[model samples]
Target: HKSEVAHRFKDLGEENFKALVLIAFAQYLQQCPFEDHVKLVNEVTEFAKTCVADESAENCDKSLHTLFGDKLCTVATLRETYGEMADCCAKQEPERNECFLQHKDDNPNLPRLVRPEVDVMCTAFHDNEETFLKKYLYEIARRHPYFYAPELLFFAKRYKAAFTECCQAADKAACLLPKLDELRDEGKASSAKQRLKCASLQKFGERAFKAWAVARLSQRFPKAEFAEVSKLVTDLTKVHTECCHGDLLECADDRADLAKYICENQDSISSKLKECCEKPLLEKSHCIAEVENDEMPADLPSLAADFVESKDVCKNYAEAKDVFLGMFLYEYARRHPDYSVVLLLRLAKTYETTLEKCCAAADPHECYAKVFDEFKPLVEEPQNLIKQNCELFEQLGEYKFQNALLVRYTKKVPQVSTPTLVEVSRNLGKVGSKCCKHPEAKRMPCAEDYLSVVLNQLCVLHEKTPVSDRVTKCCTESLVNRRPCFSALEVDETYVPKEFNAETFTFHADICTLSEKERQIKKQTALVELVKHKPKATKEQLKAVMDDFAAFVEKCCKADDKETCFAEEGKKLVAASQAAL
Candidate 1:
């Protein structure tokens, strides 16, 4: 095991791995109050700064023992965690956190995460609130001990409020135990919520977290340069890491500086950060925290390499449960950036379910490999098409992009009328323009909710059409998956050119008299009708036709022989359409 750890860790580097080991042990023990975890964090960081590379591991082990040795400060579980981490000082170094985490286990003489009988909880709190609270933290800390101090602190606060209200009841156990159950339900969210991210921030330490966050944010906001994403993440959760165990006002201040960078970076980063910026000082951080992230930028590489290269799911997951689940959430969230934190957890749960089921198999790896293959397309196809269209709107300007939607829908389901398709595209474009103005974080969800209405209208318009296989199936999709179905439907391969009178294609010379706005609308109307005529037309052919019409107006509208010039250029326009067909 030692040799294997050393080998796996060669790429992870010893200097960083020891520091990561420091952060992990601190996070594990933070709520216990066995030692000042911050002092531990500081000591290891100081060691990281001062120790020579050759003596680093040897010296750091001594430093941890010196800090960790107090009888009151000592935790056998954390001590054993240290030995294992030291045995492993680990990864490609987030791998280090994963490595550190596998050591988690139920302790010999302590209560695990489960609350005692309601009678016991009520009596304990009634006897001494402070003592009970300390015991509560000490017990829970090691059980699901992965949370950062703020959320843990938040839990304690929530506990006080719940029990204080409930304990006032004559039936203290009845009132209080239900409240504790509710609290457990809240943590059920930790399966895939902000807690996981917070845990990683607190446990991974800022510098190590920054390395992963940079890779993560770069995928989230590819329009921004790597250095730009780099700085955004440097403080991304760095503020969360700092303020986690410290003063509220100080965290607020550090957070403002970080938010300001992205807020000002609204051009290429998220515009949502700008929305968060306008709030009163502290509320701004709350707003920014709730803001969703952008869709994964196209072509970022996969995060599945660790799993793909590893031999067995149970080999890693059985040893490092949350570490593996955290990896699942982290990878899935990165790939599907549009999902809500709750939804991401739900998605992560599916992986959790799959792993456990497959691990029960006679051949776990084979079962895992086979079962999840059927799942891969399901992950990519249904939801990602919506992401694809949203990305297109980002690339194609709002005014110009309506046609892109119209062309896409027309190609997919031409059973809907040209005018209806045109109407829905404009409606969808309006949604995109409004939604895209939100910060990059909020933008994806906004467009998704708003655009789904436009898609449903298309489904309604085609409700009576007999050629309804795709359209019917699309509407039948679970409400959320429905839009991407319409989004991703294959082109109407059976489509042939629907000829409108080529007479509409020709321009008139009396044409110069209308107001500029009216004239522009009429010309655009002509082009719209033209594109609908040939939904299957090559885009370049459509472009040639558009150019011909604009050229016709320029040359013939004001020519001396107006009618003659009109007839001549109009024939060229005819020729353009014929050629396109």
Candidate 2:
């Protein structure tokens, strides 16, 4: 207590003194008992509270009032600190209040020096955080070079350079800490203790490497001086400190840097990463032969070129590549049996491609089409190999290297359990969590390509169905993000119903039967009709026209049906109405 305050206590009597002592004791007891009990509890706890309270009190109180008495210091060096802090908080920092609260106790010499501005305090802290974190981040990087991923830290332009500098500095600091001459003459006991500390540092460096690798593999962020990273590391450090007394986990700063890296670089930021990453290549001997001598593998491609023309070869390929894909096709066909030949043909193509590239075959087209026909119920006869290997279809290409094409062709489309518009939004968080973490395999198809292929398949199935509607909202949403894989064909009322518009429709028919030319024609005509002043036809008239068009399409598309001339439901309605009229 100050002498000025001591005079205020002079009037206190014994009873009052006793009362005052008891009051202080009771108050201390309520918050933290044994504050005055020197031996009973930790001595540091008592001191820390005052420090915290002092820190929490008005900033610049001691220096502003006690020394300067509201007369602001004009000294250039002294003012620089305040000016920097102010600029930092106002322009450079994030979460100003929290930053001020956290680092308030950073400098005790300038006690009670209140913040010129809250924003300034935060800004200073924000700037200092990078400097502080760099000390720890580089320590990890120096010890764990394998953990670095170029893409992880490429998000924000400003942070990348700072993060790199900090990482380098940390490496330097770690090297300089040892061989202090003052400690060199220590006895055996001290030497042992110091060696143990050094061991702890090494262990910490290793653990940091693992943590950093996991974070980088997740592709979360770049090196940054972020408080969230600091807090996370701090909490993590508490555990580290307790476990090894702060000897291990020397690279505590990396967590802050990593978090900063992740936050600022959260999206698919631009990078020269594709060039740096290795390209995917087919494992076939033929393909490998194309590679430079240095890149050659020990084996040839898995499928033989001789069997490319055989339906059996196609069936064999499908059976071997992925049993599940074949099963999905079978189940798909069971629901849509009319287009079984077309579906089987697609499967045959999928299977054949996995073996020798189908393009290698002398009669690859004929072989693929026949193989397709054989698998379909339309032919009502699949080979024994197709029947036996149904289960293998799904698993064949998943894990194998040579069968990368099969695995890629069957990559899962991004969607929720039920494909719908609302469902896609709900699944966005989960999809972002997974896909953003790392690049898909170079040998395998990307998310977008897979979606387009699937959409194309669906379109083929739906093209012939005049009465059938498109798929649900979730399906369309899933396919839409796969933009490169699927192009939107503008739709109109003439070919597709109003409900199955370009942005809204989901194809749900036999996917192989649809022709690209037909789809293009339908889209163009529909777009023209949509812009019409008024639809002149009645519902019945429209229905008749639609039926006639459907019949016309089937006749033109299916050579077998050309001679029969079966009238579509729409054509029959038009014919009946004209006779009545």
Candidate 3:
């Protein structure tokens, strides 16, 4: 191993390598004790300052003999271990000194330990310096009986920068000595200098721990890209830096504050940082859910309950369903940007409520795809018609077919001003028709391919026009359709309810296709939306109105048509929503 070390230093040339070996061995001996370490360091520095190589070489060789004894300079031993010294010997004066210093690290093997390890050890020396030195003194006196004190002094001089940095403040060396004798004297105060070294060691340990933790995390996640992991660490470092400045150790134990900071800043952080820190989507969700549910109350309702009860339930539910579906579209857009956001949101809205109901049920994640069953038939016929007419529709221009398709889907519904619902329904019809007509129709890309395309369109369109208007319009339909359409009609300027009221012109059975229960459900769903818009409604008033709704539903349940059974009651709810304002 020593021979290999010599070979490793071959680049430094023989003289410089030998000089490095001498310095290293001297430092190793310096681990003996404080006084000896200091004295030996001074001796080596004094020797190095004047002992430049010359033809006689007597001063250097004589000093080496005096320091390490005859065996250190023996011809055979010199050839084997110190041959590199000749490289330095050939140099002249100050150049020789610079050469030795430059080449000191050429033979990495000459040093028993790495620089960081030595730095760590020297940092330890600063704590209770007297006790540490005494311990090393005892160990070395017993283990290294032949070592001379001068060698330790030489080591001290060589590593003085490291020593003063750890043991004293700034460049001052007078404070390096520990006053054990005075400290042992009762009531004799230890000066600030004695505590300064410990402070330095405290900072050193913090730095070391951070470095070690980063390295460990990198090793643990070998599969993760280094740049990604590094970006996350950099972000985290900035977070801590902003909070604690340079005193990492002060905040190191406060995890709650750290977690709170992350929680607050999670969205503000760069998306790349978020991506790098998070596990895969499903895994990350599961991990967060587990932690969130740990202390969660058992009686807490589902996220769906919040959406379902909101005044804009469909809108809210649509938002949620869209967000989940958008995850895929986002990645898809990264690769292909032509997919439509409008179309995606539209298609998602069609089944969004169905999905929301399933998600709202117990075991939220279990039946994610169960709603697809309900969704299939809703789109099936429209998709078929579109496929059958694809060639003719293509010739007629796709927009005409799309418009006709939307009109066809919307006209089958009740009369209402819920434009967003109408628009979304129309859009869904278009997507269903377009996607299923593709050559890979058997794969049925309605849920996937069509959703992506529509989503792509929505993103582009919404950048210019607000998307909320669509939701508001969709939600407005329940209020709009509940009354006599003629009452709100704009016929050139004035409107007359008696002229076109559906109730006066036609049999309620002819127009009211919704069953009594279905009508009540719609009324309640719509009521929630109205209440959401009018937050001024008091709890007492809301409860009273809700109770009236229940009573009305009970009385009207047997009626064939909601208009005939509870038209007046519907007016009461509509009036209350306005009155609450």
Index of the highest-TM-score prediction? 1
- lDDT scores of the candidates, listed in order: 0.57, 0.30, 0.37
Q: TM-score, each model?
A: 0.38, 0.20, 0.18
The candidate that achieves the highest lDDT relative to the unseen native structure: 1
Model 2 stretches astray by more than 4 angstroms:
1-126, 131-158, 162-307, 310-488, 491-581
Candidate 2: residue 241 lDDT (0-100): 43
Candidate numbers sorted by TM-score from highest down: 1, 2, 3
Residue 536, candidate 1: C-alpha displacement in angstroms: 5.2
lDDT of 2 by residue, 447-477 (tens): 2222223343343333433222323222233
Which lDDT tens digits does candidate 3 get at residues 1-581? 12222222343343333433333344333232345434443454444433332323334534231333322222233334445643654665445534433332211232232223443545666666544443443343323222222233223333444354545455233333222212222111111211222332344443332332233323222233434334444544554443232111122223224444433444442222343235432123223212310111224333333332334444444565443433222222222122222222233444455556655666544555454355355445434544565654666444444433333322222222334333444455555455545563332333343433333333334444553443223323322121112113221212111122222212232224575435433443344333333434454765566566567656555575566556666565556645655
The TM-score between candidate 1 and the true structure equals: 0.38
TM-score of model number 3: 0.18
Better of 1 and 2 by TM-score: 1
Better of 2 and 3 by TM-score: 2
